[PDB]
Design a protein around this motif. Sequence first.
Motif, PDB file in Angstrom:
ATOM      1  N   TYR A 152       0.911  -1.267   0.112  1.00  0.00           N
ATOM      2  CA  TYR A 152      -0.040  -0.202  -0.028  1.00  0.00           C
ATOM      3  C   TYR A 152       0.841   1.444   0.031  1.00  0.00           C
ATOM      4  O   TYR A 152       0.575   2.298  -0.215  1.00  0.00           O
ATOM      5  CB  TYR A 152      -1.026  -0.017   1.240  1.00  0.00           C
ATOM      6  N   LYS A 162     -12.738   0.060   1.434  1.00  0.00           N
ATOM      7  CA  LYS A 162     -12.718  -1.372   1.464  1.00  0.00           C
ATOM      8  C   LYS A 162     -13.949  -2.158   0.843  1.00  0.00           C
ATOM      9  O   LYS A 162     -14.220  -3.265   1.211  1.00  0.00           O
ATOM     10  CB  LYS A 162     -12.272  -2.051   2.710  1.00  0.00           C
ATOM     11  N   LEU A 180     -28.086  -3.192  11.534  1.00  0.00           N
ATOM     12  CA  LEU A 180     -29.587  -2.595  11.645  1.00  0.00           C
ATOM     13  C   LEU A 180     -30.595  -3.546  11.589  1.00  0.00           C
ATOM     14  O   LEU A 180     -31.572  -3.498  12.325  1.00  0.00           O
ATOM     15  CB  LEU A 180     -29.577  -1.546  10.412  1.00  0.00           C
ATOM     16  N   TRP A 227     -36.300   2.604  11.303  1.00  0.00           N
ATOM     17  CA  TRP A 227     -36.087   2.645   9.865  1.00  0.00           C
ATOM     18  C   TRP A 227     -36.537   4.071   9.303  1.00  0.00           C
ATOM     19  O   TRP A 227     -36.085   4.741   8.449  1.00  0.00           O
ATOM     20  CB  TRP A 227     -36.619   1.745   8.981  1.00  0.00           C
ATOM     21  N   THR A 240     -17.634 -16.538  -0.468  1.00  0.00           N
ATOM     22  CA  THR A 240     -18.424 -17.895  -0.644  1.00  0.00           C
ATOM     23  C   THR A 240     -17.573 -18.882  -0.897  1.00  0.00           C
ATOM     24  O   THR A 240     -17.951 -20.183  -0.897  1.00  0.00           O
ATOM     25  CB  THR A 240     -19.409 -17.641  -1.585  1.00  0.00           C
ATOM     26  N   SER A 262     -16.926 -16.750   6.709  1.00  0.00           N
ATOM     27  CA  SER A 262     -16.386 -16.505   5.617  1.00  0.00           C
ATOM     28  C   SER A 262     -15.403 -17.387   5.066  1.00  0.00           C
ATOM     29  O   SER A 262     -14.792 -18.063   6.003  1.00  0.00           O
ATOM     30  CB  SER A 262     -15.837 -14.978   5.622  1.00  0.00           C
ATOM     31  N   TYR A 270      -9.678  -8.393   9.675  1.00  0.00           N
ATOM     32  CA  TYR A 270     -11.166  -8.474   9.183  1.00  0.00           C
ATOM     33  C   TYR A 270     -12.060  -7.910  10.390  1.00  0.00           C
ATOM     34  O   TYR A 270     -13.075  -7.294  10.242  1.00  0.00           O
ATOM     35  CB  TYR A 270     -11.800  -9.888   8.798  1.00  0.00           C
TER      36      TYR A 270
HETATM   37  C1  LIG Z   1     -26.931   0.688  12.826  1.00  0.00           C
HETATM   38  C2  LIG Z   1     -25.760   1.251  12.621  1.00  0.00           C
HETATM   39  C3  LIG Z   1     -24.539   1.387  13.370  1.00  0.00           C
HETATM   40  C4  LIG Z   1     -25.762   2.132  11.325  1.00  0.00           C
HETATM   41  C5  LIG Z   1     -26.920   2.560  10.443  1.00  0.00           C
HETATM   42  C6  LIG Z   1     -26.592   1.314   9.270  1.00  0.00           C
HETATM   43  C7  LIG Z   1     -27.758   1.954   8.199  1.00  0.00           C
HETATM   44  C8  LIG Z   1     -28.037   3.493   8.073  1.00  0.00           C
HETATM   45  C9  LIG Z   1     -27.987   0.988   7.228  1.00  0.00           C
HETATM   46  C10 LIG Z   1     -28.989   1.587   6.047  1.00  0.00           C
HETATM   47  C11 LIG Z   1     -28.462   0.686   4.610  1.00  0.00           C
HETATM   48  C12 LIG Z   1     -29.298  -0.368   4.302  1.00  0.00           C
HETATM   49  C13 LIG Z   1     -30.550   0.182   3.143  1.00  0.00           C
HETATM   50  C14 LIG Z   1     -29.173  -1.725   4.394  1.00  0.00           C
HETATM   51  C15 LIG Z   1     -30.028  -2.690   4.096  1.00  0.00           C
HETATM   52  C16 LIG Z   1     -29.845  -4.241   4.537  1.00  0.00           C
HETATM   53  C17 LIG Z   1     -28.642  -4.738   3.851  1.00  0.00           C
HETATM   54  C18 LIG Z   1     -27.874  -5.873   4.226  1.00  0.00           C
HETATM   55  C19 LIG Z   1     -28.170  -4.226   2.612  1.00  0.00           C
HETATM   56  C20 LIG Z   1     -26.978  -4.819   1.869  1.00  0.00           C
HETATM   57  C21 LIG Z   1     -26.120  -3.882   1.220  1.00  0.00           C
HETATM   58  C22 LIG Z   1     -26.551  -3.502  -0.250  1.00  0.00           C
HETATM   59  C23 LIG Z   1     -27.664  -2.610  -0.402  1.00  0.00           C
HETATM   60  C24 LIG Z   1     -25.718  -4.116  -1.261  1.00  0.00           C
HETATM   61  C25 LIG Z   1     -24.603  -5.045  -1.010  1.00  0.00           C
HETATM   62  C26 LIG Z   1     -25.048  -6.299  -1.684  1.00  0.00           C
HETATM   63  C27 LIG Z   1     -24.677  -7.621  -0.683  1.00  0.00           C
HETATM   64  C28 LIG Z   1     -24.320  -8.913  -1.329  1.00  0.00           C
HETATM   65  C29 LIG Z   1     -24.571  -7.232   0.584  1.00  0.00           C
HETATM   66  C30 LIG Z   1     -24.192  -8.261   1.460  1.00  0.00           C
HETATM   67  C31 LIG Z   1     -25.436  -8.822   2.414  1.00  0.00           C
HETATM   68  C32 LIG Z   1     -25.033  -9.301   3.860  1.00  0.00           C
HETATM   69  C33 LIG Z   1     -24.837  -8.388   5.163  1.00  0.00           C
HETATM   70  C34 LIG Z   1     -24.790 -10.818   3.959  1.00  0.00           C
HETATM   71  C35 LIG Z   1     -24.885 -11.726   2.742  1.00  0.00           C
HETATM   72  C36 LIG Z   1     -23.673 -12.725   2.993  1.00  0.00           C
HETATM   73  C37 LIG Z   1     -22.767 -12.659   1.629  1.00  0.00           C
HETATM   74  C38 LIG Z   1     -22.825 -13.909   0.897  1.00  0.00           C
HETATM   75  C39 LIG Z   1     -22.034 -11.292   1.334  1.00  0.00           C
HETATM   76  C40 LIG Z   1     -21.154 -11.371  -0.012  1.00  0.00           C
HETATM   77  C41 LIG Z   1     -21.058  -9.804  -0.351  1.00  0.00           C
HETATM   78  C42 LIG Z   1     -19.675  -9.323   0.690  1.00  0.00           C
HETATM   79  C43 LIG Z   1     -20.232  -8.044   1.380  1.00  0.00           C
HETATM   80  C44 LIG Z   1     -18.666  -9.927   0.735  1.00  0.00           C
HETATM   81  C45 LIG Z   1     -17.502  -9.329   1.478  1.00  0.00           C
HETATM   82  C46 LIG Z   1     -16.813 -10.480   2.536  1.00  0.00           C
HETATM   83  C47 LIG Z   1     -15.484 -10.097   2.575  1.00  0.00           C
HETATM   84  C48 LIG Z   1     -14.304 -11.479   2.834  1.00  0.00           C
HETATM   85  C49 LIG Z   1     -14.834  -8.895   2.690  1.00  0.00           C
HETATM   86  C50 LIG Z   1     -13.497  -8.585   2.764  1.00  0.00           C
HETATM   87  C51 LIG Z   1     -13.089  -7.222   1.969  1.00  0.00           C
HETATM   88  C52 LIG Z   1     -11.609  -7.345   1.176  1.00  0.00           C
HETATM   89  C53 LIG Z   1     -11.619  -6.945  -0.063  1.00  0.00           C
HETATM   90  C54 LIG Z   1     -10.710  -8.079   1.919  1.00  0.00           C
HETATM   91  C55 LIG Z   1      -9.383  -8.362   1.165  1.00  0.00           C
HETATM   92  O1  LIG Z   1      -8.496  -8.839   2.007  1.00  0.00           O
HETATM   93  P1  LIG Z   1      -6.790  -8.721   1.899  1.00  0.00           P
HETATM   94  O2  LIG Z   1      -6.684  -7.987   0.737  1.00  0.00           O
HETATM   95  O3  LIG Z   1      -6.310 -10.307   1.641  1.00  0.00           O
HETATM   96  O4  LIG Z   1      -6.125  -7.969   2.796  1.00  0.00           O
END
Ligand SMILES: CC(C)=CCC/C(C)=C/CC/C(C)=C/CC/C(C)=C/CC/C(C)=C\CC/C(C)=C/CC/C(C)=C\CC/C(C)=C/CC/C(C)=C/CC/C(C)=C/CC/C(C)=C/COP(=O)(O)O
Length: 541
Positions: free
Chosen positions: A34, A178, A190, A203, A247, A304, A311
Amino acid sequence: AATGWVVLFVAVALVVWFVSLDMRHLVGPDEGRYAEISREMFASGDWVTIRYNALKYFEKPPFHMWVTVVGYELFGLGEWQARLAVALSGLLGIGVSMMAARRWFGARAAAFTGLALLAAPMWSVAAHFNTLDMTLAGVMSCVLAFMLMGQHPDASVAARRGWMVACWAAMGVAILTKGLVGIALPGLVLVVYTLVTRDWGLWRRLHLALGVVVMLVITVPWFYLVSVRNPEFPNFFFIHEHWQRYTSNRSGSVFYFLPLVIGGFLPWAGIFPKLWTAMRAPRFRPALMAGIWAIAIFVFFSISRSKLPGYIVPVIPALGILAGVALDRLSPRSWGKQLIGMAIVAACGLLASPVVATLNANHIPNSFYRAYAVWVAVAFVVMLLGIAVARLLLRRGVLPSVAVYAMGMYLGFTVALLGHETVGRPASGADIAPQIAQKLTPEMPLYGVQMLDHTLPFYLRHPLMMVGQADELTFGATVEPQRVVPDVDSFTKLWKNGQPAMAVMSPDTYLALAPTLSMYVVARDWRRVVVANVASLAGPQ
Ligand SMILES: CC(C)=CCC/C(C)=C/CC/C(C)=C/CC/C(C)=C/CC/C(C)=C\CC/C(C)=C/CC/C(C)=C\CC/C(C)=C/CC/C(C)=C/CC/C(C)=C/CC/C(C)=C/COP(=O)(O)O
Ligand SMILES: [Cl-]
Ligand SMILES: [Cl-]
């Protein structure tokens, strides 16, 4: 009123906070990678297309690199400039978490949150390691804490609107840091909160319209620019870096983060159950929101397929807030139990210091680890001293004893962090960088022969030309094959009758190319052999 003890504390906290950034060399792979990406982005002026050693690196979004490039512009190149992003992110997490705690649970509980996050080895140590985990954790710390700020009953409607717009903008910066995890995780927290609390009207107090707009007007620009200039970006970044990463198989067991939490929050392990009690006595339940934050994210990364220790860093701020609650309900004797138990734990860590003198990892000799065990032991000694002085000041109250305890723990883990320089210095390849730079020019190629060096090109201020297996640059090596040598034979033909250049390889690679290719050693290292094609750039052989 006795504020001079606070100020001084903060002073002693801040100095050690920044000096520790420039006390050791960059360690691979994250810090050098980085830091070098930020270096190329800084020298080339192109802030859209992320490049690593002149090849495209579309595995991460560029907020961290933006911050680090600003650090390079204001403070030049160096180590602490590379760690400046994660440092300011740690200070950000501490400060904003203290703000939320003071808004909800009072000033004393906020002080205990500051001491808890300051003493947590994952937060303090990860705040001095150049990786995107800490920056994401600080930005998402602004997410959680701003969510707590806006949802306060005594807050005005304009205040709630401000904190909610700042919350959506915060998670927007998080996904700009990220990826989609900065919007997926808080939404999941949430959902779980609204499930356990049955408070669906929550909400309504989120400002989805204005908030979503503010998030899109800050995250859409870069993704659109890098997607138009590079049409192959969205498929790779959204498919391979999220779906294929979560996955499908950096693997591990389900309990892979079970010790990393207990280790990352070790000085407060004794109050781990009491934190749960904080979720019982928090309309809006803040302590339950933080508990659902930590538990939800911990379960999310515990199942994961790809797992790295950084993480679960975002769970530390919330875990700190609950800590500041628990420590606030403790009697003097109740803290005495913590001082005794953690004194025994630190003594066990002191007796277990000679274990480091047996390890030899990453092809680093046992001598450097023999030197590391000394600094580990000194670290545990600092912890024992802090615990002792804390017991001496327990009669003055629980707050000053916890303050001296957290200061001793922070200084201790800081010593254990700087002690890793004994191992990281021979691996960083910074000692051979002067001997190489005396003959290396910017017009000269530096072929990485089947080796992706993360720290050497930075200290050389000179990118690599990937030869053979490009590792994580393979994608970048395939999109633009003009900047990469495919196989080793083309490197041979480019070496014999080619241009004057140097090559970084492994000792085994040198032993393989020795019977065939005539090369003269420029610099030798424990993991590197740097050669040149012309016999003028070397010395005696
Ligand atoms: C309540 C509080 C505090 C605040 C308020 C909050 C607020 C306002 C909220 C309002 C906002 C709102 C409408 C929410 C609505 C409710 C909601 C859930 C919407 C979702 C968000 C939206 C719309 C689209 C996103 C689409 C997706 C698929 C989201 C995931 C869904 C979840 C959760 C679980 C599913 C499980 C799986 C199969 C996930 C795979 C995808 C990922 C994500 C993979 C990362 C894994 C990883 C390993 C990542 C490492 C990264 C990386 C590159 C590592 C590299 O590592 P190195 O380089 O090696 O270091
Ligand atoms: Cl107790
Ligand atoms: Cl180090």
